[PDB]
Enzyme design. Sequence first.
Site, PDB file in Angstrom:
ATOM      1  N   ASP A   7       0.860  -1.182   0.000  1.00 28.45           N
ATOM      2  CA  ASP A   7       0.000   0.000   0.000  1.00 28.45           C
ATOM      3  C   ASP A   7       0.901   1.239   0.000  1.00 28.45           C
ATOM      4  O   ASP A   7       2.039   1.188   0.472  1.00 28.45           O
ATOM      5  CB  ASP A   7      -0.898  -0.039   1.237  1.00 28.45           C
ATOM      6  CG  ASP A   7      -1.902   1.090   1.280  1.00 28.45           C
ATOM      7  OD1 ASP A   7      -2.174   1.741   0.246  1.00 28.45           O
ATOM      8  OD2 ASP A   7      -2.439   1.309   2.378  1.00 28.45           O
ATOM      9  N   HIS A 283      12.336  -9.208   7.940  1.00 28.05           N
ATOM     10  CA  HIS A 283      12.010  -9.992   9.122  1.00 28.05           C
ATOM     11  C   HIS A 283      10.640 -10.652   9.248  1.00 28.05           C
ATOM     12  O   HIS A 283      10.294 -11.123  10.334  1.00 28.05           O
ATOM     13  CB  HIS A 283      12.272  -9.117  10.355  1.00 28.05           C
ATOM     14  CG  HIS A 283      13.675  -8.599  10.433  1.00 28.05           C
ATOM     15  ND1 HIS A 283      14.757  -9.421  10.664  1.00 28.05           N
ATOM     16  CD2 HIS A 283      14.180  -7.354  10.254  1.00 28.05           C
ATOM     17  CE1 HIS A 283      15.868  -8.706  10.624  1.00 28.05           C
ATOM     18  NE2 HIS A 283      15.545  -7.448  10.375  1.00 28.05           N
TER      19      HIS A 283
HETATM   20 CA   LIG Z   1      -3.196   3.361   3.415  1.00 27.17          CA
END
Ligand SMILES: [Ca+2]
EC number: 3.1.3.-
Length: 285
Positions: A7, A283
């Site tokens: 995003d 990670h």
């Molecule tokens: Ca967003």
Amino acid sequence: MKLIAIDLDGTLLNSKHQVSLENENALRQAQRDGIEVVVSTGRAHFDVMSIFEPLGIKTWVISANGAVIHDPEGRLYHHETIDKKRAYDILSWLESENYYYEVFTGSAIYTPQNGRELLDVELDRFRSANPEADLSVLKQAAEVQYSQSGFAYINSFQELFEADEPIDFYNILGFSFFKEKLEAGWKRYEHAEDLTLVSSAEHNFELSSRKASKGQALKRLAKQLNIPLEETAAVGDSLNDKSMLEAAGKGVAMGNAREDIKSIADAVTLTNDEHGVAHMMKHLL
Ligand SMILES: [Ca+2]
């Protein structure tokens, strides 16, 4: 993972709407490892390019809430439009009901709002993603963001239909400072089977075609690249990211994510400001 969907606002971008050195390095490393990187947003493709161009970043881009897909070099892969009569219906209602609105099309983002009003919409995006951030830092960044905007003014939505020129409707953002107006908008379209209804900030809602959602666009791309969904991951903080976390084999929530996004996630990373995207790359996957 062979494909990673990321995003833009509140995720790849920090609270100052910058792509940190850490995140840039993480993106390039992923591409270096042969992983297909996709950035997914409710904004326009050119809004993403304005941020990536100066940095030399090139990724697949899902824009307009999954209505549009471009490859790293800007080649068009897909455009999913809202039926013109339905678009007319939506815009006529939004305008008559005093909602601020932005119409994402191919050419530009049409809107009848002025600068102050458009900045308020943007500030809401910033504040919703990082409620803990200093208002002055967010405003300054929101202004820089607006200064690079690609809005086109219209007196009325009518102008988008009374012209003999090609114009496709990809995503429509509606905004209101009032809770009552926001609930009314949601109730009006939440059951519309020909549309996709989401939100990218506390005071807005976005409407795209039924087949246009971040999750469906991710599936569309994965299929074309012959990549199993089990080998895909998606990360986000806002409500409009729900469908792509659900679609991906591994859904990751940002540290600053909404509670419902954290709830459905398989993993949770650091906040956008703490380079959560980079942390996930090194990670969590
Ligand atoms: Ca967003």
